[PDB]
Design a protein around this ligand. Structure first.
Ligand SMILES: [Ag+]
Ligand SMILES: [Ag+]
Ligand SMILES: [Ag+]
Ligand SMILES: [Ag+]
Ligand SMILES: [Ag+]
Ligand SMILES: [Ag+]
Ligand SMILES: [Ag+]
Lengths: 171, 172, 172, 170, 172, 172
C-alpha cells in the first residue's frame, strides 16, 4: 500500500504524461498548419505513446491498491517561431519529464519503496530513447537553417511514423 | 472557407470530445476502484472512441483551410454514489454532447455552410448509437438495484469490450 | 562469489518459496474439501509458480558459484474459517514474502552486491503482480459474504487456471 | 468411507512422496555443486515424478470422501561422499518407499479395503521401474570406481532427462 | 547529458570490452596452436560477443548526446601453460570486467545519473551469465588434470559454438 | 612451412587489417557525432570486412603450420575537418594497405614461397574493389562542395549498407 505522498507523486506524473500527449497533439496542429503532414503524423504517433505511459501509471497505482485521481490538463502553447523552435521546446520538455521521473525514483529510494522504484525503471530506460529520438530530429533542423529543400525531405522521412489508433475506431 | 464564428464552434466541440474521453477515463478509474474491471475496460474503450471523434474535428478543420486551437481540459468528477449513478451522469453527458452537436448543425444551416452541415451528419447518427449504448446499460443497472449477482454478471458481459491502444504502443 | 551471510539469505528465501508452494497446496486441500474445485486448481497452479520461484533462487546460487542447502519445510495450517479468511491469510503471506524480498534487496545494497540486487529485481516486479492477483480475488470474496451464488460463479472463473505438471508425468 | 486408520496411512505416504521429491532435489543440489549438470537434471526430473506421485494420493483421498492433512517435510542430507554413495542412498530410499507401499497394501487387505488396494497397484508397478532405474545407474557408478572419464560420459547420458516444469511457468 | 567524469568512464569500459575481445582472440590463437579447434572456435565466438558489448556502450553514449573516443588496445598475452591455466586467466578477467561494471554503477549512483545506472543493469545481469559460462568449463578442466581423453571430448562439445561473422562477409 | 621473415610479415599485415577495422570504427564514431547515421553504418559494415580480412591471415598462418602473434592496436585519429577529408584519409589508408600487400607479394616471390603468393592473390583483387569503393564516394563528396542537400542524400544512399554482427549477438 502506497504512502499518501507517493500516491500523489504517481498521480501527478500520470497528469504530466497526459499533458505530454496534449502538448504533442498541439505540436501536431502547428505542423499541420504549415502543411507538414509528416511532422504532424509523427507528433500524433508520439502523443499516443504518452497516453500509453499514463495508462502504465494508472495500472500500477491500482496494482498497489491505490486510487487514481485525474487533475485538469492545462492549455498547451498554440504557436512556435519555427519547426526548429518547436523541437527545441519538445526536447526541453522531454528533459522536464525525465527530471520529474528522477525525483520520483529519489523519493522511492528515500521511502524504501522498492516496488515503485522497480516500476520506474521502465520509464528511466524509456526516456533515454525518447530524448535521443527528439534530439536526432532537432539536430537535423539545425542542419537545415535556411533550406526548405531539406525540410521537405525530412517531412517525407517522418511520414513513415503514423498514429495507430485512427484506423481502429468507429469507421 | 470557415467563418470566424464557425471555426470557434468547431474548436470548442473538439475540446468537448476530448473532455468526454477524460470523463470516461475518470469513470474507468471509479469502476477500477470498485474492482469492476469489465465496466472499467468498457469505459477505456469508450474514451478511445471520443479521442477518435476529436481527431475527426481536427481533420475537418484543416480540410477547410482552418486552424486548430486546443483549450484546457477541465478536471472531471472523481467519485459517484453507485455504478447506477455513474451511468446516469454518463447518459446525461451524452445528451449534453448531442445537444451541442444540434447547436453546431443549426449554426451551419444559419450561415448556409453546407460543408460543415454535411460533416456534422456523421456525428448526429453516431450520437444516436452512443446514447442508446449508455441507456441500455443504465436500464440494466436500474434492473439490478439491490442485486450484486447481476452486477457481477454485468461486469463479465462488458469485459468483452476492451481498449485497443494499450497492446500496440511501446512495450515492456 | 557470494558472502557467507548472502548465501544464507538466498538459501532461506529458497526455503520460503518452497513453503509458499506448500501453503498453497494446503489451501488447495482446504478448498477441495468444500467441493470448490476451481479455487483448488487455482491454488495448485499457484503452488507450481512458487516451486518455479524456488528454482530461480537455486539456479542463481550455482551461477554465483555458491551452494544450496535445503532446510526443513514446516507444517502449514490445515483449516480456515471461510474461503474469504483463507484468502486474507494468503494476502497476509504475500506481504510477508514481499517484505523478505525487500530485506534481501536492502542486504544486497548494504553489501554492495550489484549482481544479487539485479537478480532480485525480477522478484520485486513479480511480487507486485502476485499481490494484485490475490487482492483481486480477496475483494471479490468480500463482495459475496452471504451470497453462495457468486461463490459458485467465482469458482467457475478460477477453474480456467489449472496446474501444468500433472499431465506431463507418468500416466495411468 | 475410508477408515480412520487408513486415512492417516494415505496422508503419511503422501508426505513420504513429498520428502522423496525433496530428497532428490537435495541430491540434485549435490551433483550441481560437483559440476555434474546431467546428474543434477536427472534428479530434478525424478523430483517432479515424486510430486506427481504425491498428487495421486491427494486425488485418491478426495475421491473416497476423505481429507488431506499436510505434515512437515523433514530436512534432507546435504552431502554424500561420492556420486556412487549418493545413488546407494537413493537406492536404499527406493527400497524404503517400496516397503511402505507394501505395508499400505497389507493394511488394505486386512481391512478388506479393495478400493485402496486397487489404487496402490499402480504404485507397486511404478516402484519396480523406479528401483530398476536407480540401480542401473548405481551399477554403472560401481563400474567406474576410479574413472572420471566414464563419469564424464555418464553425465552426458543422463542429461537427456530434464525437468519439464521450469519452461512452463512465467 | 553525461558529466565529464561519466563520459570518460563509459569510454574506458568500451575500450575494456574491445580488449576483452582481443584477449579471447589471443586465446583462440593459443588453442589453435595446440590443435584444439573446438576451444579456438568457442573463443572466437566469445570474442564477437565482447565486440557487441562495446557497440552497446557506443550506442548509449550517442543516445546521451556524448562523444566516443577510441583509445589504443594493448598487446594481449601470447601463451599459457595449459588450457586449464588459459581458462583461469579468462575467468580472472571476467571478474575484472564485472568489477569495473560495479565501479561504473557506483559512479552513476553517486552522481544520481539514473539513466546510466539503468543502462548498466543489462551488463550486470549479462556478466553473471558470462562468469558462470567460463567457470563451468574451468571446472571441467580441473576435472581433467592428467586426462587427454576428456580434453578431446571437451573439444568436441565446445565446437558446437562457432563464430557468426565469417560466413557473412565477402567470400572467395 | 613458413620462414621466420615471412611469418613476421604475415602477422604484421594481420595487425594492419585489425587497425583498418579500428580506424573505420573511429571514422564511424566521427560521422555519428555529425548525425550522419548512413555514413556511420557504412563504416561499421566496412570495419567488419577488415576483421574478416584479418581472420583470413589468421587461418592461412595455421594452415602453413605457423603461429599467430597479436601485436598492440595503436590509437586511431579522433577527428577530421570534414566528411570529405575523412574519406581522403580513408583512401590514403587504402593505398597504404595495398602497398603493404604488394610488398608481401614481392617478398613471397623473392623467397620463392608460391603458397603465400597464391594466398595474397585474393587480397590484390580485394583491394581493387576496396579502393574503387572508397574513391567512388570520395569523388561524390568532392561533388557536394558547398551543398548540405547532397550530403543528406548521400547519407541515405549509404544507409543501405549496414553492420551484420549486432543482430546476431546476445540481445536485450
Ligand atoms: Ag465513434
Ligand atoms: Ag513509450
Ligand atoms: Ag511467478
Ligand atoms: Ag512416476
Ligand atoms: Ag569417450
Ligand atoms: Ag573484403
Ligand atoms: Ag553478451
Amino acid at each position: 500500500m502506497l504512502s499518501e505522498r507517493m500516491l500523489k507523486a504517481l498521480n501527478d506524473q500520470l497528469n504530466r504524461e497526459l499533458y505530454s500527449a496534449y502538448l504533442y497533439f498541439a505540436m501536431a496542429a502547428y505542423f499541420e498548419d504549415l502543411g507538414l503532414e509528416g511532422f504532424a503524423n509523427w507528433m500524433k504517433a508520439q502523443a499516443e505513446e504518452e497516453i500509453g505511459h499514463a495508462l502504465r501509471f494508472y495500472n500500477y497505482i491500482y496494482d498497489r491498491n491505490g486510487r487514481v485521481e485525474l487533475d485538469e490538463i492545462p492549455k498547451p502553447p498554440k504557436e512556435w517561431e519555427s519547426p526548429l523552435k518547436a523541437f527545441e521546446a519538445a526536447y526541453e520538455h522531454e528533459k522536464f519529464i525525465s527530471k520529474s521521473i528522477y525525483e520520483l525514483a529519489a523519493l522511492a529510494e528515500e521511502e524504501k519503496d522498492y516496488s515503485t522504484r522497480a516500476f520506474l525503471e521502465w520509464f528511466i530506460n524509456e526516456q533515454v530513447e525518447e530524448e535521443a529520438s527528439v534530439k536526432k530530429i532537432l539536430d537535423k533542423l539545425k542542419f537545415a537553417k535556411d533550406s526548405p529543400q531539406i525540410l521537405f525531405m525530412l517531412d517525407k522521412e517522418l511520414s513513415a511514423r503514423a498514429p495507430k489508433l485512427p484506423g481502429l475506431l468507429m469507421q
